[PDB]
Amino acid sequence: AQGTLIRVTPEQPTHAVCVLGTLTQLDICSSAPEDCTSFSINASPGVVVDIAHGPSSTWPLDPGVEVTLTMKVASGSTGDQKVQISYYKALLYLTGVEISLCADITRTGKVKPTRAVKDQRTWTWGPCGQGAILLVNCDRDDSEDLQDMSLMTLSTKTPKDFFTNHTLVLHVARSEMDKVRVFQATRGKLSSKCSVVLGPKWPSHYLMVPGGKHNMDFYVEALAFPDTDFPGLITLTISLLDTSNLELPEAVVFQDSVVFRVAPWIMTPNTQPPQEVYACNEDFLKSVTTLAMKAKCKLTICQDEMEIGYIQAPHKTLPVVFDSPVMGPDFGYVTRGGLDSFGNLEVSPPVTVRGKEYPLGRILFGDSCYPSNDSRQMHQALQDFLSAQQVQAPVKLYSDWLSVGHVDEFLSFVPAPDRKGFRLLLASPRSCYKLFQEQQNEGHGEALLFEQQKIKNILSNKTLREHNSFVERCIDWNRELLKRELGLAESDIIDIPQLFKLKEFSKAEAFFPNMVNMLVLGKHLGIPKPFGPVINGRCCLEEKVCSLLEPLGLQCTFINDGTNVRRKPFSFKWWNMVP
Amino acid sequence: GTLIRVTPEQPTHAVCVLGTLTQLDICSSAPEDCINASPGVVVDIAHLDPGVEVTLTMKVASGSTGDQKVQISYYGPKTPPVKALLYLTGVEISLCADITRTGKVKPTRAVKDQRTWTWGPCGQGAILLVNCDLDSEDLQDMSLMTLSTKTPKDFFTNHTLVLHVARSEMDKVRVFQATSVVLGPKWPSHYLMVPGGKHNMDFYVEALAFPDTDFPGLITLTISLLDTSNLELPEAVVFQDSVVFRVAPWIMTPNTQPPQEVYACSIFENEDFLKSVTTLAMKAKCKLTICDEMEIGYIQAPHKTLPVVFDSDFGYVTRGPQISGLDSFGNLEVSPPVTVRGKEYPLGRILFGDSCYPSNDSRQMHQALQDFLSAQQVQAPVKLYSDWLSVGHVDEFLSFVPAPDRKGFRLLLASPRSCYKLFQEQQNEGHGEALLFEGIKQQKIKNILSNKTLREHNSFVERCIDWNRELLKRELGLAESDIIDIPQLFKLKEFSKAEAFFPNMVNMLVLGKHLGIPKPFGPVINGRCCLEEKVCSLLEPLGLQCTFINDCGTNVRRKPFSFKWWNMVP
């Protein structure tokens, strides 16, 4: 997007070096004779002079005669073409070269030329844009090494005398050097003695490229993830330096730039197909083995502190594990940056709220409502991390009335074949009381619960009935919040009975084991053992959830009583999103 | 939304804040399978068939608890008619500020979505001024947000109101109570005590930090209603309303703006200079003051435009270098209003100096200053090439002057080429032995014209101004007719840097149309200096009455813009 200014003088020759693809303008009113208004331009075969007037060729030399000097080919000898500016004679010698820097700019996964739209000047969000994508090395302390790196090729086409008085430099801005590492490849073999040229210690390297046709390749990799200080963009640059006289400082002629964006960390919701179970009671383990066998997923024996997300690039997609203070060749630990634990984090299935579409879902974590002395909040650094990665926007719910403080204690997402496709499950202290009252009216009012009290005591303990009220006005507030940022109607909210007992520091804890914290392996489910009244063979408590979930198509098993699950990445690719 | 669930066993109570949707759920607890409304409520339905949403709306805030009543009847042949009684209470709570950016508190009767900030010619948001500096200064610059409540007199014995700022933006906001701090850098939350009836509480707001690297500049203040009906149990939240604020950025003023006041620090040995600058003060009207690299700007809010000073009431701003030769304030310049490839920058673009590519001696501005000036999106930075100079400021070869035709401004770039043209044409018409440097080496024009070592140094310099010329042409979207080439001469010295040969003229003092210009002590031809005639014949046709001084720092404050920054769309 640069242009040169070759100011021609009619009393001495002028020599120029223009790079093809640059609007070269030959300014005339620089040393022209005071008299006359008819100069003309006698050109040469190798130069296309597209002279136009202000918005042979006997043109009036009024101020504003724009002259252009676009050419065709790369010179094989200095001064191949010539220009004459008559005055009724100015001489101009000219030589040309071809410098280019082309990475994967159209995001096709190839080495596409830099001639794409808008070249490589800015990153533009959306399905119609330009800009290459880099990966952070998910590694801890040849072909296999280069399988996870980009490839920037520098093609030089210069005559065989050009690089005795010229050179090139490759540089990265001093503010961003700690976040890029550029390897270099020798022409002997694609993988032969690769050493770093630019990195966190040397921000500018003087290349040596011999004259003539020559295309040599760099590999590029990142070193850090998006964060508060780091928006996500790196800029690499080439520069041609003229060093004709060996007694004066060098000068700049040509500067080509390429922009890169660092791939972010994306989580996987519960509504995606499974790929592997990294398991850590022997009966529970046997039940998990049966559940995996019925779901034909790979189970490995060696813990809710990590989430197996992925980093997506046009060439490769790599799983990544993030844990707050299984390996193989591809996993990596992010080291970027009760309420601050990792249980307070769930990513929602694909949703579209308020017209704007969020193809990758929305991240959900919990905090308090009014900051106070005794309020527990998520660590600010991790919040800023998960907000810096804008592919999944943060959503803040209310979890400070629970002793544990996690969010998974009262919400969960399951698949569905009809309506939207995903069903939101909310714990409800209200449906269980209605079920117990109905069972009492049906004739059973002395049942054995936790077999430990009877249904009578549970339905006549006034303190419990007053406690569940406050634990019902908070899940309702979370419900109204979830129905505003996810655009959920009243039909996609299934209620799962689960009582609470306000006893510990006036906080909330479950009465019988939670039925909302489930284990979803594709279509199949694993639900904790809800000890409850055994009314007519089957238990009443383990009947409502079955009758509420089975008609969808989902199955429900009941494990008597911490395994991580990896899920396939999204088919939608984040560089097509428009945040 | 506020879902209200009525039970057919016992009556239910509820409090509603007016202006918010209030649906009631009725299919959930209905016995079997298949509404009397009082004057104070409105009931409507739009598709006990599951999914029949029914909504309630109010007309006015209640007078006493449970005056308006809604009865839902489950009529049935098989099951005797059941009834659900819902005793509603209605209250009004509003928290409003200058959301529509006029200048009034703009009492919002639920008309605007005050919970978002959007750049645009017309939209929603509140502007907050910084406190770069209670009986005074409270009625003038601190923003006003008012809280109006209409509730029964026996209602706040049970319900309490709290006000909270997020704990990540508490060192940057301070809220005072009208006759006194309630929130600030130590107390995220305050518990207000609002009586019954009606009560308009006035809240004053101030900020404490300019937009920077970590602060995007968006403070949100929120009111919450808490139900303290019981004493053993903790309370729950029922209603939350918020107002968003944006911190006013630091804007700089370019050359073309007419002056308001001209400052100086002249003490002694100035002599003629002072007289000369004073002469300008009377010709181009200014207020001339009299008693070190500071730069003057302003901050704008719909209640006040305040002049501020950036150093390295008036106050000061210090958010940058918490320094090399390029971090001084002569390195920063502001372009007049500009248009680039369609996108219009009505307030101009900042220009700063930096090298081309990093090396062992690529002196660059401290990254704190660059990121501070890029946090203010009002005037986006443009990185020039000013490393070849010893001092390295960009004021040594470029400057803008007010033009009355075409675009409106003239960019004056130094050009070593034109001075050779002047001397060559002068010698082509005789008298080619004129003297030069008459001030205080009296080298002849012939010696300068025949020198074989100055030409290389000037050629290299001409290879550097062209690059900045092309960069400016692309970035600012200019053409050839807006660039004048003042003659100047350069000479390379030790450490291979460039310094002016005879005193520079591009660093000129612009008092409107009037121009104070330092003197090229040079040739004496025909009676008037040649370096004093090219500039005249190039500038005076614009109308600028050029004057020549014998140069000293004179900072000039210039009148703020007409185009407001909130109207911009970055």
Author numbering:
A (entry chain B): 2 to 56, 65 to 97, 105 to 157, 173 to 311, 316 to 337, 349 to 371, 384 to 395, 403 to 516, ...
B (entry chain A): 4 to 37, 42 to 54, 70 to 155, 172 to 217, 226 to 337, 350 to 370, 388 to 397, 401 to 518, ...
What did the publication describing this PDB structure actually write?
Citrullination, the loss of a positive charge on the arginine side chain to form citrulline, is catalyzed by peptidylarginine deiminase 4 (PAD4) of the PAD enzyme family. PAD4 is implicated in rheumatoid arthritis (RA), where citrullinated epitopes serve as important diagnostic and pathological factors. The active form of PAD4 is a homodimer, and dimerization greatly affects enzyme activity because monomeric mutants are less active. In this study, we identified GAGs as physiological allosteric coactivators of PAD4.
To explain the lower activatory potential of shorter oligomers, we determined the structure of PAD4 with Dp12 in the absence of calcium. This structure also contained two face-to-back dimers of PAD4, similar to the Dp20-bound structure, but they were connected by a single Dp12 and angled differently (approximately 73° in the x–y plane and approximately 38° in the z–x plane). The Dp12 oligomer was again bound proximal to the region spanning a loop including R123 to R137 of the bottom dimer. In addition, one more Dp12 molecule could reside in loop R123–R137 on the distal side of the top dimer, possibly allowing for the formation of longer PAD4 dimer chains. These structures were observed in the micrographs as a separate 2D class. By plotting the maximum PAD4 activation and Ca0.5 versus (vs) oligomer length, we determined that approximately 12 sugar subunits in the GAG chain are necessary to achieve half of the effects of native heparin. The observed change in the dimer–dimer organization between Dp12 and Dp20 at 0.1 mM Ca2+ consists of the introduction of an additional GAG anchor point for a longer Dp20 oligomer, which introduces torsion sufficient to pull the dimers together and form the 90° double-propeller, cross-like structure.
